[PDB]
Amino acid sequence: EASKKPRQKRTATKAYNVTQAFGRRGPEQTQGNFGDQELIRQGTDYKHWPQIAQFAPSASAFFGMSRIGMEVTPSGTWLTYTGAIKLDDKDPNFKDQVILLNKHIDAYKTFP
Amino acid sequence: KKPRQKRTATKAYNVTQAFGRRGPEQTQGNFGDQELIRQGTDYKHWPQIAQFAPSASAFFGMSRIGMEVTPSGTWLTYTGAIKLDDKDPNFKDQVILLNKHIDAYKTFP
Numbered sequence: 001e002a003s004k005k006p007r008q009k010r011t012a013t014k015a016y017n018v019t020q021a022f023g024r025r026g027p028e029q030t031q032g033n034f035g036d037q038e039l040i041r042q043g044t045d046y047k048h049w050p051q052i053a054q055f056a057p058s059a060s061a062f063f064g065m066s067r068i069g070m071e072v073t074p075s076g077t078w079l080t081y082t083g084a085i086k087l088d089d090k091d092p093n094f095k096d097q098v099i100l101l102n103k104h105i106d107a108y109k110t111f112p
Numbered sequence: 113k114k115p116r117q118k119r120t121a122t123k124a125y126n127v128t129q130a131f132g133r134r135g136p137e138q139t140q141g142n143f144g145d146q147e148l149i150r151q152g153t154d155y156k157h158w159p160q161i162a163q164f165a166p167s168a169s170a171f172f173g174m175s176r177i178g179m180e181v182t183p184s185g186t187w188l189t190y191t192g193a194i195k196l197d198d199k200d201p202n203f204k205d206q207v208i209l210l211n212k213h214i215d216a217y218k219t220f221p
């Protein structure tokens with residue numbers, strides 16, 4: 001039931017984890033690089049998910065803020081995206097936010 | 113003043129008001145024709161566009177995420193790609209729709 005969904009609409013959870021929904025973390029251009037082993041294993045059941053999720057864009061923001069392209073290639077047709085989301089450094093939590101995000105960025109380098 | 117990434121554009125609060133002018137620069141959005149820019153989530157093809165926007169889980173799962181410090185602040189960066197389903201009956205309509213919007217600003221009067 002979880003795996004029936006198009007990839008961009010999947011919701012990772014302990015039962016259907018980040019690796020299962022979105023592939024092994026890793027270094028390549030269109031492979032995901034985000035998550036330490038606890039997030040990878042728990043998905044949205046991760047205890048600090050909401051403090052990560054506060055940075056994800058709404059659908060309107062996703063198409064409003066991003067640089068969208070379309071590439072047709074031997075594998076299919078791909079909607080490419082790029083953008084950046086500013087952290088609020090007025091937020092007393094800003095320090096914590098950074099540390100939490102950096103915990104998960106490229107964390108895969110540190111384990112098998 | 114919701115966080116920018118949480119805003120939702122509508123006729124009352126439009127793509128330009130919410131996310132700024134469409135343009136060539138790396139901090140600007142390039143997506144939307146004049147009608148989508150005016151209507152936001154009221155746009156008559158919104159559902160067919162939104163079908164490609166990632167869940168929170170998917171945004172963080174699929175993307176290459178980074179963090180950069182610049183004079184304007186600290187930025188969570190993201191890049192990646194969302195494969196269209198070839199075998200969907202509506203694939204061809206999706207292509208047309210996407211083409212209508214990507215860098216549409218280049219032809220605005």
Ligand SMILES: Nc1nc2c(ncn2[C@@H]2O[C@H](COP(=O)(O)OP(=O)(O)OP(=O)(O)O)[C@@H](O)[C@H]2O)c(=O)[nH]1
Binds near residue numbers: 021031193195
């Ligand atoms: N970046 C990106 N990669 C994708 C996308 N769709 C498929 N891929 C990659 O191509 C592979 C092809 O697998 P699919 O059958 O499309 O999806 P799956 O989740 O592996 O398979 P099921 O869960 O059994 O449906 C995936 O494992 C991904 O790594 C996408 O929308 N974006």
